Amino acid sequence: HRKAAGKYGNTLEFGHLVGGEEVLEGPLLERRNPSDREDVVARFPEADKDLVRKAALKAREAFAEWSRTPAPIRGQVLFNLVKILEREKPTLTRLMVREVGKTPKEAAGDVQEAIDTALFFASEGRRLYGQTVPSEMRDKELFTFRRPLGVVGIITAGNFPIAVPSWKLIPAVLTGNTVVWKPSEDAPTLSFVFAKLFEEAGLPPGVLNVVFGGGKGSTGQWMVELMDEGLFQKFAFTGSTQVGRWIGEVAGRNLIRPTLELGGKNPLVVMRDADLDLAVEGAWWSAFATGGQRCTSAGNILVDAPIYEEFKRRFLERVEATLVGNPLLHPEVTYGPFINERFFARWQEHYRVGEAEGARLLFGRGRITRENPYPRFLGDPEAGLYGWPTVWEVRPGTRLFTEEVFGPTINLVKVDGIEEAIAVANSTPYGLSSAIYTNHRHWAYLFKVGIRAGMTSINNATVGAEAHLPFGGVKASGNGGRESGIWVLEEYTYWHAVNEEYSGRLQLAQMDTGYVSPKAPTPWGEVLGL
Template structure:
């Protein structure tokens, strides 16, 4: 997109996602918007209402701050969306979102939400809850279905914004957005299957029923590595069950979150059912969690680090408030001698370095049987050394792009040092990619973004810190196993239990691995990554608190069972005490004589 300076802002048209594009007729405006309501398009010259939080999200397009980015893409002024209204931070503070593949590309400025902003969102959600909970579940499902159809309509635009904002490849971003679509399409019909039960009573003239009831206001906090898929994992089942939400967007993906929340409202979502606040984890995120102590939140759903998850669990626990915690992982992948080596290499390579290793399900410990260790490692290292790295929006066929942000890059470099401190043998990798320090298949200008080498460390043993600790980035630690029992022991030895995998063509080994591994998810002859929208997602041990995302199982996380007994007899009947006793009448018969 080739935007002119805003002081020459021309008559405009609206792209599929509402981004303002110039035509060849100029007028003088500082800021311009497009509003589409009732089929009519109109220019809005005065944005004072927007700044004061008086404009509804569906009455305005996207406010373009600048068109000076090196790639020609616009810089947008983003807002919180509270009770359907566009609002800035109450103190006016903002932060920027930048493209990690091209740091000079600023996607926009977004509110650094205050405690007051978060509380405003919570009160909006609280006010919207009774009406939304009373909305028939099939109607809620219809709105969710509308969301899925709108996501499909705008998929290409959403994919490109996700790649621009967090640096994932276009192919991976497309997968993330498709997962959000799949979640909507799955749950649109669950609105007609929000089943309870009719149960027979032990007493006459009495009926027993069970119903699912919504919890109330849900606080939603997710990481930025899956900024489309994961919030939909959380919010779609939450609102399908009749809850309302306050979503604290990932600090590194505010534009995508802003777009998605707008689409939710376009789908027919009533005001206040989903409220969006931007900001830091230590700011808006902490304010949202602290609101549990103030009685303003009935549920927290969090995806992030184990340390933060434990803190959230403690706050929720002391208030007897439900929480869903999807946390870190040191995911093992075992390679046995009977496996197809080509398949195992492909699976391990993708699990380790897809998304630059920035998935909670990325491969941590690669456990290889000693009998095939040399052959496997030769093939694996050949793949690693040929890795194509770069900006997917400018280069084809790259395996991964930059780190999600400069902060993720700094944290990765800091934690990477534990491998060498432990005495592991570095087979490949050299930290930050620069113009003077880049692998042969790096594409583009390394100085523009936050790129990392792929790293491989061998000779890792169970007593090393790097065996146990998650390192969030493109690195894999290699562990040699003596036999299957040793491999299974190693796979269970870390404090995490999110995902796992075993490559073997021995069906007994596959069975023993499935039944012996302590993990929430397992792949047989498949990688540690690749969740599907209709399967439960979550971990055990340090990877979570036992709750699950996705599929029908997630409904348990966003509802409670309400048991109702309806007395029709017109009198008090006491369970257990007024039940007629049926006596045994033994016949005078010798059954042993018949044997």
């Protein structure tokens, strides 16, 4: 951590964290403040594949001591981290606004998710329950224990730069594993600091190693490839489905079950009996929280025929009122810039794909500029990449309907009755989150058991999962793993079954078992006289 003054804070320069050492090796990258490109947040190196290799070997060297550290002591380290995150929450909030362009409200929420996670798993150090199981043989006892896997490879996005890494890092080390972490190039400073807070909390050197870099053709890819060298016993990834399937494949052949959170096209249904203003507010927040840059963001609002026109009218009213701007200078805004150029580009393209397939554009004029200004913009739109709130009407089966698009866009879709709403809600390659606004018990029930989704909200947004429920998707949104709560323990441990014999002889299950035979049946119809 060395300095040099920028305009919204110091420009930091730092290296990889490998075996406790800081390592400034590789071509320098930089992260610019997405709200103001003049402000340079960090300068950091790109780890080459040899350095990721070295990091995996430090992690391997650290595993023996860490796995033998009693789980309750490892949990005390996480408790130290709860206190330290609490202390640092205002500072991490402000750094997150500068580095990834989130609002202070949402940035604090993001940090809070990590605190919540750290408290849950601090206590989990005195749990991690296995089972005692009765043998079918005399003088024999059966047991199960949860054991750590080894070295975990972790790759994380930058839209939730503290929360979502915490879901992986914290349970991974709690359960006795060591970690190599390749964080997003969109949030290197936050990632560096987080790793230093784990260090402050007492995590031994080499249990967490941090290698900075890009993804495709860079450190991200190098690290996935190292699964073929046996240097990882586990892998976790948050990002695109397409990258996910590739990581699925590599891990697959190396007999690893990766944790894959892969995005979504999240349906939000509004039935004719819904509380309109509540549903409008829920649809709006589902679409525009984080400027539509969440895996869980609303993809399609499916609106019941009899309220379509009224809902549309009220929803456009609500969207028109959205404040957009530089969240450092204007904290009251709903959303600010795109996190990176990649997402801005895919978002630009969706306007063209929409027009080409016959979608109707109701609201939105693409990138906000001086030449193309937005009536409720606050700040300089040329200092970064900011998008008009965007609303379409679309038919099912179209690319705008089925394909994930990060950024401030949403589709309205007319449906008629509950059976159609469920079928249209399922007509996507995804199955992460979902939502229905209704007051009818029966309609909520049908949606709940008829949707194919990892997560459903009744009269609530598609966004804003609580930290202590299982998080994960079906279909193209993931592969069966769940994060958070007790459910993530399956991701970072394996079952060890033990049978202890005391009988002093070889006795064979299923063959020597001393099953008791019936006695002769009494003819009760005859005895009772029916």
